Design an enzyme around this catalytic site. Sequence first.
Site, PDB file in Angstrom:
ATOM      1  CB  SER A  40     -35.873  -9.257  21.466  1.00 40.10           C
ATOM      2  OG  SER A  40     -34.663  -9.212  20.745  1.00 40.10           O
ATOM      3  N   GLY A  41     -37.532 -10.587  23.868  1.00 39.16           N
ATOM      4  CA  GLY A  41     -38.743 -10.589  24.669  1.00 39.16           C
ATOM      5  C   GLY A  41     -39.138 -12.009  25.035  1.00 39.16           C
ATOM      6  CG  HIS A  95     -35.798  -3.832  22.948  1.00 36.13           C
ATOM      7  ND1 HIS A  95     -35.498  -5.009  23.596  1.00 36.13           N
ATOM      8  CD2 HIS A  95     -35.878  -4.137  21.632  1.00 36.13           C
ATOM      9  CE1 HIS A  95     -35.406  -5.986  22.711  1.00 36.13           C
ATOM     10  NE2 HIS A  95     -35.634  -5.483  21.512  1.00 36.13           N
ATOM     11  CG  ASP A 130     -34.458  -5.129  26.957  1.00 36.91           C
ATOM     12  OD1 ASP A 130     -35.457  -4.420  26.683  1.00 36.91           O
ATOM     13  OD2 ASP A 130     -33.932  -5.910  26.130  1.00 36.91           O
TER      14      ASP A 130
HETATM   15  O1  LIG Z   1     -29.067  -9.099  14.737  1.00 36.96           O
HETATM   16  S1  LIG Z   1     -30.048  -8.384  15.680  1.00 36.96           S
HETATM   17  O2  LIG Z   1     -31.447  -8.446  15.057  1.00 36.96           O
HETATM   18  C1  LIG Z   1     -30.048  -9.128  17.290  1.00 36.96           C
HETATM   19  C2  LIG Z   1     -30.274 -10.453  17.524  1.00 36.96           C
HETATM   20  C3  LIG Z   1     -30.283 -11.103  18.913  1.00 36.96           C
HETATM   21  C4  LIG Z   1     -29.315 -12.174  19.213  1.00 36.96           C
HETATM   22  C5  LIG Z   1     -29.286 -12.828  20.527  1.00 36.96           C
HETATM   23  C6  LIG Z   1     -30.227 -12.430  21.585  1.00 36.96           C
HETATM   24 CL1  LIG Z   1     -30.202 -13.209  23.151  1.00 36.96          CL
HETATM   25  C7  LIG Z   1     -31.194 -11.361  21.292  1.00 36.96           C
HETATM   26  C8  LIG Z   1     -31.230 -10.710  19.995  1.00 36.96           C
HETATM   27  N1  LIG Z   1     -29.608  -6.708  15.864  1.00 36.96           N
HETATM   28  C9  LIG Z   1     -28.165  -6.459  16.287  1.00 36.96           C
HETATM   29  C10 LIG Z   1     -27.832  -5.018  16.778  1.00 36.96           C
HETATM   30  N2  LIG Z   1     -28.891  -4.445  17.694  1.00 36.96           N
HETATM   31  C11 LIG Z   1     -28.582  -3.068  18.189  1.00 36.96           C
HETATM   32  C12 LIG Z   1     -27.502  -2.851  19.313  1.00 36.96           C
HETATM   33  C13 LIG Z   1     -27.252  -1.349  19.747  1.00 36.96           C
HETATM   34  C14 LIG Z   1     -26.153  -1.199  20.877  1.00 36.96           C
HETATM   35  N3  LIG Z   1     -26.239  -2.192  22.069  1.00 36.96           N
HETATM   36  C15 LIG Z   1     -25.817  -1.803  23.485  1.00 36.96           C
HETATM   37  C16 LIG Z   1     -25.900  -2.769  24.627  1.00 36.96           C
HETATM   38  C17 LIG Z   1     -25.482  -2.348  25.954  1.00 36.96           C
HETATM   39  N4  LIG Z   1     -24.999  -1.063  26.214  1.00 36.96           N
HETATM   40  C18 LIG Z   1     -24.903  -0.128  25.184  1.00 36.96           C
HETATM   41  C19 LIG Z   1     -25.294  -0.439  23.816  1.00 36.96           C
HETATM   42  C20 LIG Z   1     -26.775  -3.613  21.736  1.00 36.96           C
HETATM   43  C21 LIG Z   1     -27.815  -3.760  20.565  1.00 36.96           C
HETATM   44  C22 LIG Z   1     -30.259  -4.489  17.086  1.00 36.96           C
HETATM   45  C23 LIG Z   1     -30.677  -5.892  16.559  1.00 36.96           C
END
Ligand SMILES: O=S(=O)(/C=C/c1ccc(Cl)cc1)N1CCN(CC2CCN(c3ccncc3)CC2)CC1
Lengths: 235, 51
Positions: A185-186, A42, A88
């Site tokens: 990520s990554g 991604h 991913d």
């Molecule tokens: O705050 S963030 O920037 C992330 C930070 C982060 C923290 C811990 C780790 Cl190890 C990696 C990254 N943000 C949150 C929402 N998602 C967008 C989401 C869209 C829906 N989703 C899924 C997963 C599995 N099956 C169906 C749908 C997960 C992701 C986009 C990005």
Amino acid sequence: IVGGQECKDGECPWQALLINEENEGFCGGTILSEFYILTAAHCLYQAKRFKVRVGDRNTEQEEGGEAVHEVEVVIKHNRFTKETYDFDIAVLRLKTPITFRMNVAPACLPERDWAESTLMTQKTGIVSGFGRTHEKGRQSTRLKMLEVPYVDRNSCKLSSSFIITQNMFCAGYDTKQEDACQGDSGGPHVTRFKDTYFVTGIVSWGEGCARKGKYGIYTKVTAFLKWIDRSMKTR
Amino acid sequence: KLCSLDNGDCDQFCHEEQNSVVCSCARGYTLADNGKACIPTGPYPCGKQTL
Ligand SMILES: O=S(=O)(/C=C/c1ccc(Cl)cc1)N1CCN(CC2CCN(c3ccncc3)CC2)CC1
Ligand SMILES: [Ca+2]
């Protein structure tokens, strides 16, 4: 990387950074060897054209140990899809080889069986990246590292609001304010065994950052080994 | 035998092929004379912090 410590000299040498035109880091990667970088599929979407940076611990003060490499070909897993975030994973073939020096070295790829029973059964793993140190703040300037305990595969599913596939696993804390975040990520998820580190996961996703009740979702590396080898022979 | 004991006393990979233990190492390492320890064959072997 919310919470956690700073990567001191040579501590996180297998760390990599994907930079865009603006020359700003948008994702992480793991150095597998002099020609290949491991990252999330991604992340290939979040940027027009990009290059990778190694030996960089402070995005501000130029460090002579740095180097910029261009990508020759990106091997992105076909089965990957944004709807599920399953598969991913992706491998990058660099045009020029990486000069292993201090703060620049590859992470070991483990044997699948050994890893699942010895590596992932350990209490913790290490995750790092230049990502946000807060759910709302900005991309970090310093490369951070975070010890993240493995999460019982069950708690993972229950706490999660989405289908935790067999190609993923959880790591982090339930309450403590520590976990990866955007830009991370990554990045590399490594496990330690007798001073030698092994790649175990790819910073995939989460529902926010360090949210109480939620965990960090990582691509299960041990589930793509043979795929990674195939990729290093390019395919 | 018993890679479960303490990893069969290996440095890295442990296999129980046959009745005994069988140690091995990641690419870039060579199995020692004792068939247990792993030895780097280069200046920057994988998984090692460049301290
Ligand atoms: O705050 S963030 O920037 C992330 C930070 C982060 C923290 C811990 C780790 Cl190890 C990696 C990254 N943000 C949150 C929402 N998602 C967008 C989401 C869209 C829906 N989703 C899924 C997963 C599995 N099956 C169906 C749908 C997960 C992701 C986009 C990005
Ligand atoms: Ca720098």
